[PDB]
Amino acid sequence: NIGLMKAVDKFEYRRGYKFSTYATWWIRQAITRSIADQARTIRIPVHMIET
DNA sequence: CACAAATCCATTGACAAAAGAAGGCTAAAAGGGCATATCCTCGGCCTTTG
C-alpha cells in the first residue's frame, strides 16, 4: 500500500497505459525491499541478498 | 677523631616508538526509476444445449 501510494503520486495518463502496468512496478519493488529489509532477524543488506 | 676515592640521584640530549589524528580512497550499503497486461483447484453460476 505504501508503494502503491508512491506509484499513484507518479502516474501520468498523458501516455495512456493502464494504471496496473505502471504501479505494479512500484508495488513489487516496495514489497521486495520490505522482505529484504525486515524479514531476517540479522539484517543482510539488499545487494547481498540479491547475491 | 682529620683529609680524597667510590657510588646512589637527579638533569640533558638524542631519539626510537606508541599513540593518535587526519586525508584519501574504495567497497559496501542505501536509494531511485522502471510504462503492454496478467497458476492450479474448487466450486458457485450462469449459457448453451438438447
mmCIF file of C-alpha atoms (C1' of nucleotides) in Angstrom:
data_model
loop_
_atom_site.group_PDB
_atom_site.id
_atom_site.type_symbol
_atom_site.label_atom_id
_atom_site.label_comp_id
_atom_site.label_asym_id
_atom_site.label_seq_id
_atom_site.Cartn_x
_atom_site.Cartn_y
_atom_site.Cartn_z
ATOM 1 C CA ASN A 1 0.000 0.000 0.000
ATOM 2 C CA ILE A 2 2.873 2.375 0.704
ATOM 3 C CA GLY A 3 4.426 1.555 -2.658
ATOM 4 C CA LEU A 4 1.059 1.955 -4.360
ATOM 5 C CA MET A 5 0.610 5.393 -2.852
ATOM 6 C CA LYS A 6 4.041 6.213 -4.243
ATOM 7 C CA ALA A 7 3.047 4.987 -7.702
ATOM 8 C CA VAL A 8 -0.267 6.855 -7.591
ATOM 9 C CA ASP A 9 1.706 10.018 -6.916
ATOM 10 C CA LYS A 10 3.705 9.382 -10.098
ATOM 11 C CA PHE A 11 1.011 8.222 -12.527
ATOM 12 C CA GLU A 12 0.576 10.251 -15.704
ATOM 13 C CA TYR A 13 -2.286 9.416 -18.039
ATOM 14 C CA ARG A 14 -0.790 11.523 -20.834
ATOM 15 C CA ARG A 15 0.747 8.282 -22.088
ATOM 16 C CA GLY A 16 -2.381 6.137 -21.967
ATOM 17 C CA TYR A 17 -1.099 2.977 -20.316
ATOM 18 C CA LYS A 18 -3.078 1.066 -17.726
ATOM 19 C CA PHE A 19 -2.542 2.100 -14.124
ATOM 20 C CA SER A 20 -1.806 -1.516 -13.235
ATOM 21 C CA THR A 21 1.026 -1.756 -15.738
ATOM 22 C CA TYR A 22 2.834 1.125 -14.055
ATOM 23 C CA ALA A 23 2.023 0.760 -10.373
ATOM 24 C CA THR A 24 2.800 -2.966 -10.394
ATOM 25 C CA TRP A 25 6.458 -1.975 -10.632
ATOM 26 C CA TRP A 26 6.451 0.229 -7.531
ATOM 27 C CA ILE A 27 4.276 -2.249 -5.661
ATOM 28 C CA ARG A 28 6.540 -5.219 -6.252
ATOM 29 C CA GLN A 29 9.659 -3.170 -5.511
ATOM 30 C CA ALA A 30 8.190 -1.954 -2.218
ATOM 31 C CA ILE A 31 7.246 -5.475 -1.178
ATOM 32 C CA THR A 32 10.613 -6.909 -2.168
ATOM 33 C CA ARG A 33 12.631 -4.277 -0.321
ATOM 34 C CA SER A 34 10.342 -4.860 2.654
ATOM 35 C CA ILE A 35 11.103 -8.563 2.689
ATOM 36 C CA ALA A 36 14.812 -7.974 2.149
ATOM 37 C CA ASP A 37 14.972 -5.397 4.946
ATOM 38 C CA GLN A 38 12.662 -6.627 7.681
ATOM 39 C CA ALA A 39 12.284 -10.385 7.298
ATOM 40 C CA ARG A 40 15.536 -11.792 8.704
ATOM 41 C CA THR A 41 16.412 -11.251 12.343
ATOM 42 C CA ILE A 42 20.022 -10.496 11.415
ATOM 43 C CA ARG A 43 19.725 -7.889 8.710
ATOM 44 C CA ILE A 44 21.560 -8.600 5.484
ATOM 45 C CA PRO A 45 21.930 -5.642 3.109
ATOM 46 C CA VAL A 46 19.793 -5.782 -0.003
ATOM 47 C CA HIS A 47 22.572 -6.318 -2.538
ATOM 48 C CA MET A 48 23.990 -9.218 -0.540
ATOM 49 C CA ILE A 49 20.553 -10.803 -0.540
ATOM 50 C CA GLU A 50 20.414 -10.473 -4.306
ATOM 51 C CA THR A 51 23.782 -12.212 -4.376
ATOM 52 C "C1'" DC B 1 88.790 11.918 65.538
ATOM 53 C "C1'" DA B 2 91.127 14.597 60.450
ATOM 54 C "C1'" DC B 3 91.636 14.600 54.718
ATOM 55 C "C1'" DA B 4 90.341 12.107 48.905
ATOM 56 C "C1'" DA B 5 88.227 7.851 46.045
ATOM 57 C "C1'" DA B 6 83.511 5.072 45.349
ATOM 58 C "C1'" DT B 7 78.823 5.448 44.435
ATOM 59 C "C1'" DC B 8 73.385 6.470 44.741
ATOM 60 C "C1'" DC B 9 70.472 10.997 42.433
ATOM 61 C "C1'" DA B 10 68.933 13.805 39.546
ATOM 62 C "C1'" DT B 11 69.111 16.693 34.835
ATOM 63 C "C1'" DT B 12 70.268 16.903 29.058
ATOM 64 C "C1'" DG B 13 70.479 15.470 24.590
ATOM 65 C "C1'" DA B 14 69.213 12.480 21.343
ATOM 66 C "C1'" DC B 15 65.776 9.826 19.987
ATOM 67 C "C1'" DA B 16 63.010 5.398 18.760
ATOM 68 C "C1'" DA B 17 58.422 4.153 19.406
ATOM 69 C "C1'" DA B 18 53.452 4.204 20.583
ATOM 70 C "C1'" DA B 19 49.581 6.859 20.105
ATOM 71 C "C1'" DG B 20 46.710 9.195 17.949
ATOM 72 C "C1'" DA B 21 44.779 12.326 14.132
ATOM 73 C "C1'" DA B 22 43.726 13.347 9.660
ATOM 74 C "C1'" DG B 23 43.160 12.836 4.457
ATOM 75 C "C1'" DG B 24 42.216 9.757 0.882
ATOM 76 C "C1'" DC B 25 40.398 6.070 -1.150
ATOM 77 C "C1'" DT B 26 37.453 2.329 -2.200
ATOM 78 C "C1'" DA B 27 33.695 -1.253 -1.479
ATOM 79 C "C1'" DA B 28 29.643 -1.519 0.631
ATOM 80 C "C1'" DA B 29 25.163 -0.230 1.837
ATOM 81 C "C1'" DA B 30 21.250 2.627 0.659
ATOM 82 C "C1'" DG B 31 18.151 4.759 -2.606
ATOM 83 C "C1'" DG B 32 15.539 5.569 -7.248
ATOM 84 C "C1'" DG B 33 13.291 4.601 -11.697
ATOM 85 C "C1'" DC B 34 11.182 1.436 -14.316
ATOM 86 C "C1'" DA B 35 5.073 2.464 -18.548
ATOM 87 C "C1'" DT B 36 1.520 -3.998 -22.782
ATOM 88 C "C1'" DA B 37 -1.205 -6.676 -19.286
ATOM 89 C "C1'" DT B 38 -1.816 -10.647 -16.335
ATOM 90 C "C1'" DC B 39 -1.222 -20.781 -11.939
ATOM 91 C "C1'" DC B 40 -3.942 -24.678 -10.181
ATOM 92 C "C1'" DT B 41 -8.256 -26.208 -7.768
ATOM 93 C "C1'" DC B 42 -12.810 -25.971 -6.365
ATOM 94 C "C1'" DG B 43 -16.986 -24.581 -6.595
ATOM 95 C "C1'" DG B 44 -20.778 -21.314 -7.495
ATOM 96 C "C1'" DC B 45 -23.020 -19.500 -11.510
ATOM 97 C "C1'" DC B 46 -24.921 -18.890 -15.353
ATOM 98 C "C1'" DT B 47 -25.130 -20.019 -21.471
ATOM 99 C "C1'" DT B 48 -25.999 -23.208 -24.206
ATOM 100 C "C1'" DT B 49 -27.570 -27.154 -25.475
ATOM 101 C "C1'" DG B 50 -30.785 -30.522 -26.043
#
